[PDB]
Amino acid sequence: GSELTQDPAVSVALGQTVRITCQGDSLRNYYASWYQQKPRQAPVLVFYGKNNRPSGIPDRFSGSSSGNTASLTISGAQAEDEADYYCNSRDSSSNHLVFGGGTKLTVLSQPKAAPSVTLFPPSSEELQANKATLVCLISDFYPGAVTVAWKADSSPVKAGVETTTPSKQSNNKYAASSYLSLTPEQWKSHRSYSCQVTHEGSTVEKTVAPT
Amino acid sequence: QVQLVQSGAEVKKPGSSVKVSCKASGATFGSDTVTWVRQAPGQGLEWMGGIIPFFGEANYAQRFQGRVTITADKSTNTAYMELSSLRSEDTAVYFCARQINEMATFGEIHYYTYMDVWGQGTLVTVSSASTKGPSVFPLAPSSSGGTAALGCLVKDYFPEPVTVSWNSGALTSGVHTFPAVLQSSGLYSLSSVVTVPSSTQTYICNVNHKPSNTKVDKRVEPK
């Protein structure tokens, strides 16, 4: 068992049942240990061995083995279960410990929501300092996964872009932001600068220009 | 019954070294091994190493051998992890945990290695920047009924925490404070927006960056 692999992300509805898989080479000898990690806190042992569920953890979680594969089954798939689940094992050759890549379980708790995009160009006062930054703010989109792509006169731009991971607490609908930093000369060089926010299969676009 | 408490967060130079601690409450170390595992912002868990305080010898991961040093002291019942030659790629949360290797002899004699107790985690942040005061710029509005948006862009401030209050905290009509973004220079840049009827009132955002003791009021006049 030199490596463990598992799907990066999986999605299920609020009442569905999810079965996250962890496939490795040493899972024949070793039982997979399953940990739940929520964003700002340390992992929690959610399952180990066989039928050994730690105290306090709900009864939705179950472990299963089948040779080189292990699986964690969550029957309820409740909103609190939305998190990152990691599988863990011990190497046989050496005492090195192997961790799976992690699976991000997203429980679809709310209806889908379209992203609201607003693009602010570089304020004239900022241009006084010989700097410019386009601000593309996305709000109220569910599920909370979006991808931002900047363009300059029908030409995708890749440098100077810094994007925020979506996150919102006012409501379950998420929010994110993206910053395109550039100098005034670059901004006044092109005729247009576009922010394309792609959510699900849809793509919203907000364009600005030096005017 | 058992508990692991780590040391506080640490911002460290990109050429320095950290020594994060991991003190155990209740049960002593014993045979149960102490594992150090780190997690980078947005990435997954990365096993760094482990030690058995009873024997004293440790074993590190393949890529860390030479940099990391895992120690154990029974007098204070504390595990330590020293990491030298720091760099931005080492910015991460470092957890210590109690790893409990176990076996089930029935059947095929199968093993299982779990970690029941963890420490709260220690954030080690490696940046070349120093405490910097924010620069506030006005994101003005421009031409659904009404609901025009205007905001304030805080930029180039290194210390993580920063606050923004519209009209000295009197305005809360759709005011959102997006999480800041870490730019290439290691300096954070945040935005604070607000939507109001296109119709008069005075809109002033007050940014408070307590670390560097910076306070800046800013009027967002339209075009």
Numbering used by the authors:
A (entry chain B): 1 to 211
B (entry chain A): 1 to 143, 147 to 202, 206 to 229
What text comes from the article?
To determine the structural basis of neutralization and synergy behind glycan cap antibody-based enhancement of base-region-binding antibodies, we solved eight structures of glycan cap antibodies in complex with mucin deleted (ΔMuc) EBOV GP (Makona) and BDBV GPΔMuc. All glycan cap antibodies make contacts exclusively within GP1 and are heavily biased toward heavy-chain (HC) contacts.
We also determined the unliganded crystal structure of BDBV-289 Fab to 3.0-Å resolution to compare the conformations of the CDR loops prior to GP engagement. The structure of the unliganded BDBV-289 Fab is very similar to BDBV-289 Fab bound to EBOV GPΔMuc, with a root-mean-square deviation (RMSD) of 1.6 Å for the Fv portions of the HC and light chain (LC). There is a slight shift of the CDRL3 to accommodate the α2-β17 loop in the glycan cap and a larger shift of CDRH3. In the GP-bound structure, the CDRH3 loop moves toward GP by an average distance of ~3.3 Å. In the crystal structure, this movement is blocked by a crystal lattice interaction, but this difference may indicate flexibility in the tip of this loop.
